[PDB]
Amino acid sequence: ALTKSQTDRLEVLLNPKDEISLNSGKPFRELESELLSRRKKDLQQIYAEERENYLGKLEREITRFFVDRGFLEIKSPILIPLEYIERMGIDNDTELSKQIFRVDKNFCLRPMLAPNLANYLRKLDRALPDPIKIFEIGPCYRKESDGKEHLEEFTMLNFCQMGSGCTRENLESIITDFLNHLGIDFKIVGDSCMVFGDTLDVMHGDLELSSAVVGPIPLDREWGIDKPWIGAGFGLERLLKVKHDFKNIKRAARSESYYNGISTNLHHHH
């Protein structure tokens, strides 16, 4: 019989495609040696052939998709003023407020892309023709209980449009074209959150890929926005989790422990 420590170690080395059972009586060593060989060969093939990191590669694929559809690529600060949190309507006694990583006294790691993108929409409206279409991909941060679907350090895509064409129909059509491009099935369900109000959540089974919003909303005034807008935020690690059938989202994260979902800890267990 395998101990919990042993079972945990074999789970680390097991990949979704494997058809190997941890409950069929084989000694821990036979199982560990088999899996280590498979994972070493997996890394050897990546190194010999493509050499691209899944998170980087997905960012690049997504970037191409939105640039080709007329959206401006944004790269904004990750370390942001703490004041942006308050101004997003996140009161400091709320749950999301307790998820913020504070830095020094007056800054934080951004938990979302929206405030920076709201500032870009306002500013670009002075220069660009209608409709204004922009997107950003990059790191975001939230203190979490984690579990299998949450990370403290994750990667968000947020695209948005402001001016004409900002209807629920167009928003759903963009989401549909995007997830069709990635080859991911989904449904849309109505939900709500404290910050934006009513949302359209993009679901893969019970897993939330995205929350999306059809503006305008009352918050807009605080960011100097006064036109219709639509936008959606997606977690890249969640997209990878679905695409590669990972059981735990940690396999898709920035990590020292996994590379393209393959364990980097290829020592023997004792």
Place this chain on the structure above:
Amino acid sequence: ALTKSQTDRLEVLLNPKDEISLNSGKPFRELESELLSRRKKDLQQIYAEERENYLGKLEREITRFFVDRGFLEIKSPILIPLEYIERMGIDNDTELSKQIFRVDKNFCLRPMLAPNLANYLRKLDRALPDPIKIFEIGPCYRKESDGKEHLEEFTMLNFCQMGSGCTRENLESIITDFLNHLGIDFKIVGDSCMVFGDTLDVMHGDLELSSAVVGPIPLDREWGIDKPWIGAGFGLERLLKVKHDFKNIKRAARSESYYNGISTNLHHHH
């Protein structure tokens, strides 16, 4: 005569290619209106044509260069254990130690990529053939006096090789092939730093593009490295500064104030 406030505002709107003088007596308005028109047209053309962010585009170009030359693309954590700082030989009473953004009690924003990459080298050595070649591009953080050449939030490339081929000659040859690819002239000068010891600094005039190291070094033991290695770190914003002849590195940074070196603040000054 222009006030300091006026001169500063016009400097924000001026771009390197402009042949417009702020010292030839024209009223502030004539100058401000001219520059605003140029910058709006610059943004309009980016939006109509390419839509790519310089920092993102450069990351993608660099990634392709190193992947095609046999280096594995790494995406590791930005938020790292504070203990990694100590173990890099950065004592807490040193100057670099005072540049660290601490997060909670036991973490920090990484000020460099090396510790994460050292862990990857050690781990991948259990799986990959000689030589092991890896690189990472991403955000790094240092409290700075700033000025025209430093940012608190910047983007580093670090490539490294471990095993065979880890000579000064090969390191210089990679650096040369890389900067030749980017179309940037440079020289190499010997320097030294507290962490790695003797370095080879890659200079464009008086501007440091990179520090590079030929190992092994005594620090290696603390990271479980015991083979020869070579590596170099480059700032992407510094590369952009040179490529686009920016006067201030802030034009190349993740920002809400500049997009591809063009001011996003296109209001009228009073």
